[PDB]
Design a protein around this ligand. Sequence first.
Ligand code: BEF
Ligand code: MG
Lengths: 142, 445
Amino acid sequence: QERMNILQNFQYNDQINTIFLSKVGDTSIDLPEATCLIQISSHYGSRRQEAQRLGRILRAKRRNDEGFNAFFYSLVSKDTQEMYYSTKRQAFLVDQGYAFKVITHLHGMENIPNLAYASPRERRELLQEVLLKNHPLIRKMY
Amino acid sequence: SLKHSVTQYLEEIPQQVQNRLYTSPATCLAIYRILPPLAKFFIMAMVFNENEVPLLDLDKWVNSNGKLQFQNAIKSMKSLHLLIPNKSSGTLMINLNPTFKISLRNALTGGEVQNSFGVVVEENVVSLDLLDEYSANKWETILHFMVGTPLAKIPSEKVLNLLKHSKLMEEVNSTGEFKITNEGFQFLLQEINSQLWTLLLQYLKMIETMDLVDVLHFIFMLGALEVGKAYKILSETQRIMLQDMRDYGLVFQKHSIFYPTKLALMLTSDTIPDGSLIVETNFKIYSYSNSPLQIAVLSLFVHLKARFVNMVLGQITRESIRRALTNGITADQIIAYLETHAHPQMRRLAEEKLEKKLELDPNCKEPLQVLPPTVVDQIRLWQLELDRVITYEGSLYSDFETSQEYNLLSKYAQDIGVLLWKDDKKKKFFISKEGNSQVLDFAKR
Ligand code: BEF
Ligand SMILES: [Mg+2]
């Protein structure tokens, strides 16, 4: 019931435009309104889940208007095994024909008023926090 | 770049040597064609009149629009000392070199030429069957040895020595092998005309004590000759020079009479495609080319997996790209090769892509990208990966008694451009090994 309420409001409410789904909505869900897809955490090298997740935005309602191009973001940390797994989980999309564009920088990022975890003090606090993450009558007696 | 390179080499020559170089009409006919059209027009105007014309009269001919071209023409003509400026009676009179004038007059009017262009034996041979095959095979052998593919008949010690002593084809005996360089890849990217001119220019610079004027006599006369006909045999130096030129696949000898080949005429002037290829988003290359030279050059930055008669199929991989980059090849050069050997299908699809881009937003004229941007991004990213670690050789300066002295030394290093890093709080800085001696001397003084 709660997830259905979330979906209905994210669909028809003008106030809400973005949601944070998880592995539950990876496949076999029809979202005619969904248009943009972002991945911050991925299930290792799963190539099938890569395509299933991409499938959610392939049926966007406004997928025929001139000049429309859906977006699929994959955030990965450089100089880590996350790059290994990221390059391993897109070998099926590359085979199909889809090509990923590497974005080194997003222009105009500094002009945003507030950014999460912008201060080194908060960085240190988050560092410590994340590191610390790991006889029916006798019935009356009782 | 052809005329520019030849003109630069001819400009670097001394005037004393140029005056003797202009003796033979054969050399003059070749040098004349290389100059800009305006310079050629002025030279033709001056050749037929035995008088002196002021520079202002020449300036009058050029329109206001071509005034810029007039400056380049006059500068180029004066650089080679072709026009001798004589100032007298308050006027900067301009005159042509007498030797150049007489040579042009003889060539054009069929005057005495001293057989500079050679003679004819009237004993013709089959050009297509023998000349074409011989030159094609020999040029293929040299280019194959350059690209590094195995080949049985290795090139002669003459051309091998020229290659090593030139920047082309860096070799080391300790490694015991020869590898291509950045200039080597650029040479392979250049056209046949420039490919021949590069080697000939390197030979010209290599030769020492065989006269410099004689070498140009022979080369320009060879350019004058026409393929498919005999030419009886000349200078004593030119005999051994002809034998050496036979090693480059330009002139064919029976084993008394020498015959120019297609490359001889190619030297003078210029003159689906083979080499056109398709690049897919899967980092796959399909080149509709049937030539071992093209296959070998593609192997530099392509991990070949198979081949067919009509085409060659391969895959781009980090290993192959790193091999090509380690050889000194630039991603710009690689993309230039791919762009100039793009398939008509790729070109048409890219034209449609540009048309769609402009139709969507015609205000901005986006560049024409024949191949997908992802491949370019990946290649440049791999180059950045190779460039990730940066190291310098030098020494660190610290333990400075006075901040004034520290600032003085650091500022001197910055002024002479040998400063790489500094820190005022620590009063420390690092300088390049090249500038270490200069910094030490300044510190002592
Ligand atoms: F059920 Be489908 F493939 F989204
Ligand atoms: Mg379904």
